[PDB]
Structure formats: structure tokens, C-alpha cells
């Protein structure tokens, strides 16, 4: 059906490609690799993190408040006097 | 790593630490007196062991090869004739023979009168073939592996 012999038509778009053995498996890793990952992280960062940061505040609060809810047993007896 | 996977799963099927433990083991003292029998549990089967006098070895060896209901040369059976070690189950309907009893000096089955010689071969009674002889070997002079 949708085999390679019959898909989308396209017209003169030339392309170029080296043999795997003709080139290094790790081209310019430091000069270009790491900064790319850093740019990518800088793009995703503000989109992703803050909700999780919001989650943490709630997580901390919930445990802490529950601590006030229970561990502050003495507040109730203190209320008794 | 693949082998360390594959054979490992196979190792799960080969046995178990308890089944290996319950079975084979039956180390026992050679302290047993001649003509005196002692039963022992082994893989669920009863298993009598009895040291025997040389004269009994003589009357057992004297038995004709053809006369037996289930013929089997005696010296070819037991490794050392003075000791006899046998499964405690009679070959007929599975009742356990009384130790050191019967006309022939071996074992006798209460259930239906089956007789046995000191070598444990069937000699009279309904039971077809001879009492089973487990594979075993002596280690230290006082001890014996059973299995």
C-alpha cells in the first residue's frame, strides 16, 4: 500500500551523504555538542520547572501542616489549661 | 551476559535446596549387629539395612540360579555380601515385610505371606520380582551414603 515506491511526490531536492566509515562517530563534541544541549535545556526550562516547583511548595506545606495537625498535640492539652 | 541469563533460568528448574536436602542423604553407622535389621526412611520409601553372618552368605550363594522366581546372581548384586541394604516395600501390593523373618531367613510379608531370602530375592508367595536394590557406596568404614 504505502510502500516507498508510492508515496508523496517531490521534485528536484538534491541531497548528500557520506559513508559511516568515512567520518567520525563523535564530530566536534565540545565546540558544538554541549552548547546545543544547553540551549535546549534553556528553552525547556521555564516552560517545565515552575509547576514542579509549585508542586514542591505544596508537598512541603502538606507535610508540615500535617505536622502541626498532629505533632502539635501539646497545643490541645495547653488548651485544656 | 546472555548466558548468565539463560542458564540462570535453567538453574531454577534443575532442583531445589530442600529437595536436594531431603533426598540422597542417609548417612548411617555400620554399628548394626549381624542378622539384626534396622529400617530407615529414604525418599519416602522404607529402607531396611542388615549386616549378615557368613553362613547366611553361604546359604544365599548356594541357591540355584534357575530355582528363583526372579533369578539374579547374588555376588553380582550386593557389592559387599556381609551387608544387605534394601527398599522396605514388598513388590506385590506394597505392604512392608517384617524384619529378619520368614522360612528362608530373609523377610516375610504379613499382608499375604510373601517370603524372602537373606539376599532379599523373592522365593515364595504372590510377589513377582525381587526386592529392589538401591545404588550406593561405602565411604568411611563406619558410614555409608544411600542413593
Amino acid at each position: 500500500g504505502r510502500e516507498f515506491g508510492n508515496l508523496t511526490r517531490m521534485r528536484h531536492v538534491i541531497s548528500y551523504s557520506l559513508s559511516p566509515f568515512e567520518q567520525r562517530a563523535y564530530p566536534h563534541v565540545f565546540t558544538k555538542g554541549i552548547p546545543n544541549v544547553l540551549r535546549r535545556i534553556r528553552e525547556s526550562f521555564f516552560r517545565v520547572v515552575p509547576q514542579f516547583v509549585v508542586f514542591y511548595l505544596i508537598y512541603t506545606w502538606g507535610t508540615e501542616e500535617f505536622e502541626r495537625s498532629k505533632r502539635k498535640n501539646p497545643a490541645a492539652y495547653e488548651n485544656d489549661k | 551476559a546472555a548466558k548468565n541469563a539463560v542458564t540462570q533460568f535453567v538453574s531454577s528448574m534443575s532442583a531445589s535446596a530442600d529437595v536436594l536436602a531431603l533426598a540422597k542423604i542417609e548417612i548411617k553407622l555400620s554399628d548394626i549387629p549381624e542378622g539384626k535389621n534396622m529400617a530407615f526412611k529414604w525418599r519416602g520409601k522404607p529402607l531396611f539395612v542388615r549386616h549378615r553372618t557368613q553362613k547366611e552368605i553361604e546359604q544365599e550363594a548356594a541357591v540355584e540360579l534357575s530355582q528363583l522366581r526372579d533369578p539374579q546372581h547374588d555376588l553380582d548384586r550386593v557389592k559387599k555380601p556381609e551387608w544387605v541394604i534394601l527398599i522396605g516395600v514388598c513388590t506385590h501390593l506394597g505392604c512392608v515385610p517384617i524384619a529378619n523373618a520368614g522360612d528362608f531367613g530373609g523377610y516375610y510379608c504379613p499382608c499375604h505371606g510373601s517370603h524372602y531370602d537373606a539376599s532379599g530375592r523373592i522365593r515364595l508367595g504372590p510377589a513377582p520380582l525381587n526386592l529392589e536394590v538401591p545404588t550406593y557406596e561405602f565411604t568411611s568404614d563406619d558410614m555409608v551414603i544411600v542413593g
Binding site: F4, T8, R47, Q51, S69 | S12, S14, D18, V19
Partner: protein, 378 residues
């Protein structure tokens, strides 16, 4: 004429594996689906060996487990690769659904629905399987979750007794669950074949969301080794999780033998069902939490209908992305809440997290899809 194209069996291997076109630009997430298949292959065989030793009775089951962990050779490795392999199966599964929610793979609606059916079958499978250990947690987990069926108004108890096979959880029930838990995964494999069958006639989606017929690629040379890298990383996480800290993800106080007479102090479902548990515990009235429990998983079918964006991929729609990660954080909220004892601070956050969980997938998303439609002048 290669031998693969003439042989009727090889044609299936040729189309389904070696030569089906895939988008060039596929990322790491698309690996997870394949991983699921592998996980299943692992959940079967490993578990199959456990079947060689486990004895499904009310008395002998736990002792058979001690038999597996000790007397059986290498049995504990099997039990832990299995029990942790299930949790890995749900990690890969939740991520696998999540990418579908993100990249708009849900537009393949039939494949989507079949995937949902695989999800429910997986839940019944893991649930019936967790009862097998017959530990303290198992008897009461099955007790409570089967007591949920009590809620249905007319069928109610009669249905529950029909599952129990008696007036309470006991040996026949444990044998029931042994059989069903033994049989379901093999159904899951066939439905997975249907899943790929509705998938491959249209082709795999790409992260951009634009049709990628211009740059299709044969699956073999590239994605066999890419997926192999995924299998290796998966075995990394699983083997580390089992061989270093096997029980961190497990539940202590499960090891005590089940007491009908005694109820454990905290009693919680294992974590992968557990978020849904909040939707139970937060909602008032016994039946409404059941209906909410159904809607919680069944919305996913409703989601494709709710699509309003003229695009597809989430990556070009940041305002939706904010709601998406907000929703994921909400899921973490549901999990941490479900990991905790009843109290007002927890119950309030559970109410808010539940209602927010439904509003984000019903109300909020379509509207900002419209707003994004208008920001780009459509």
C-alpha cells in the same frame, strides 16, 4: 527478488519490522512503546518460572513464596525482576500514554481506543497479580477494592460474592486470581497485535506533527539499534533497581502473613493504581467515587473529541504545554496524596487536585486551543 518478499511468513516480518517506513525525526519517547512489548515478553517468561513453584492456596501460597525466595535456585532474582518489572512496565506505560497526550498521537483514534483497552486489561492484570503473594497488604487490598463493587445499586453484593466465590476473600478467590492473572497478558499480546495493526496502515507520527512522507526511513538499520539502546537502558534501570535496592519501590509490612482478624494500620494500594485511589477517597458517597474512578480512565476516549487546535503537536503551542506539565504535576500531587493517611490537609488537596484534574482536561485545554487558534489568525 529477496527471499523475504516471497515467503508468506517473511512478508509479515518484512512489513511489520524490516521495511516499514518511519519518520526520520522520531525522538526517544517513541522507543517506549517497543519497550512495552519487551516488558511483556519479560513479564511473561520470568513470571512463568514463578508459576512452576507458586501454589495458589490460602495456606500454601506464602510458604511457596518463601520456597521461591530461598530453596529454589536463583528464585529471588526472578521474583524481584518480576515484581519490579511490573512497575517498570507502568513507568514505560505512563510515559507511553503521556507522549500520546503531548504530540497529538490520539488523532489515530482507533489505535487510541485499543490502547485504552490495553490499559484497562493491564490494570486488571496487575491488580489480580498483586493478590497472589497473599501478604497482609494483598488480602486487604483485594478486600477493599472488591468491596467497591458493593456500591453498584442493584447488582451490588451479589456481584461481589460472585467474584469472591464466597462470603469473603479466601483460597478459591486466590485461585481465581491465579488463573485470570495467568491468562490476561496473553490476551494483551493479541490486542497489542491489533494495536499495531491499526497503527501501521497509517504510519507513525512525528514530533513536529507535520506529515513526513518526504523523509521516511526503513525501520531496520537505525531503529533496531536505537530500540536496542532503549532495551539496554531499560535493563540498566531494572537490573539496578532489583539488584541494589529491590524493596524501595515495594511495600514493607506486606511480608506478614494475612490476618482476616487484623487490619494493617496504613493499608494502601501499590503506587501505580494509587493516584486513582485518591479520586475514590476524596469523593463523598460510595458510588460517586466509583463513577469518578471509571471516568478517570475512560476520559482518555473523550479526549480526541475535545481537540480544537488546528495543529497537532504540543511543541508549537506553549500555552498548552504549561497546562500539560501543570497536569503532570497534578498527577504527582494525586500520587503523593494517595500515599498518605486521611486528614484535612490531605483531603483538601485531594479535592482540589481531583477537580483540577478534570477541569484541565475538559474545560481549560479546548479554550486555550481556541485562543492559540486566534493568536495565529485562523
Amino acid at each position: 527478488t529477496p527471499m523475504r518478499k516471497t515467503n508468506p511468513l517473511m512478508k509479515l516480518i518484512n512489513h511489520s519490522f524490516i521495511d516499514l517506513p518511519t519518520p526520520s525525526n522520531i525522538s526517544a519517547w517513541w522507543n517506549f512503546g517497543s519497550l512495552l512489548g519487551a516488558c511483556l515478553i519479560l513479564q511473561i517468561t520470568t513470571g512463568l518460572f514463578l508459576a512452576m513453584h507458586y501454589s495458589p492456596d490460602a495456606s500454601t501460597a506464602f510458604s511457596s513464596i518463601a520456597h521461591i525466595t530461598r530453596d529454589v535456585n536463583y528464585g529471588w532474582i526472578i521474583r524481584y525482576l518480576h515484581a519490579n518489572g511490573a512497575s517498570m512496565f507502568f513507568i514505560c506505560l505512563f510515559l507511553h500514554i503521556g507522549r500520546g497526550l503531548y504530540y497529538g498521537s490520539f488523532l489515530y483514534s482507533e489505535t487510541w481506543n485499543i490502547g485504552i483497552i490495553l490499559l484497562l486489561a493491564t490494570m486488571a492484570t496487575a491488580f489480580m497479580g498483586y493478590v497472589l503473594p497473599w501478604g497482609q497488604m494483598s488480602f486487604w487490598g483485594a478486600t477493599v477494592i472488591t468491596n467497591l463493587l458493593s456500591a453498584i445499586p442493584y447488582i451490588g453484593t451479589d456481584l461481589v460474592q460472585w467474584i469472591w466465590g464466597g462470603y469473603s476473600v479466601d483460597s478459591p478467590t486466590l485461585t481465581r486470581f491465579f488463573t485470570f492473572h495467568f491468562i490476561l497478558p496473553f490476551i494483551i499480546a493479541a490486542l497489542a497485535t491489533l494495536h499495531l495493526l491499526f497503527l501501521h496502515e497509517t504510519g507513525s507520527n512525528n514530533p513536529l506533527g507535520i506529515t513526513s512522507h518526504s523523509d521516511k526511513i526503513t525501520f531496520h538499520p537505525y531503529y533496531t539499534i536505537k530500540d536496542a539502546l532503549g532495551l539496554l537502558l531499560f535493563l540498566l534501570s531494572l537490573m539496578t533497581l532489583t539488584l541494589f535496592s529491590p524493596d524501595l519501590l515495594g511495600d514493607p509490612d506486606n511480608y506478614t502473613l494475612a490476618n482476616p482478624l487484623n487490619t494493617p494500620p496504613h493499608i494502601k494500594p501499590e503506587w501505580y493504581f494509587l493516584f486513582a485511589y485518591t479520586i475514590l477517597r476524596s469523593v463523598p458517597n460510595k458510588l460517586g467515587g466509583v463513577l469518578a474512578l471509571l471516568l478517570s480512565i475512560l476520559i482518555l476516549a473523550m479526549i480526541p473529541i475535545l481537540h480544537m487546535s488546528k495543529q497537532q503537536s504540543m511543541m508549537f503551542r506553549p500555552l498548552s504545554q504549561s497546562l500539560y506539565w501543570l497536569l503532570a504535576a497534578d498527577l504527582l500531587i494525586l500520587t503523593w496524596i494517595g500515599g498518605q493517611p486521611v486528614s484535612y490537609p490531605f483531603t483538601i488537596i485531594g479535592q482540589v487536585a481531583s477537580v483540577l484534574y478534570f477541569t484541565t482536561i475538559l474545560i481549560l485545554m479546548p479554550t486555550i486551543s481556541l485562543i492559540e487558534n486566534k493568536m495565529l489568525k485562523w
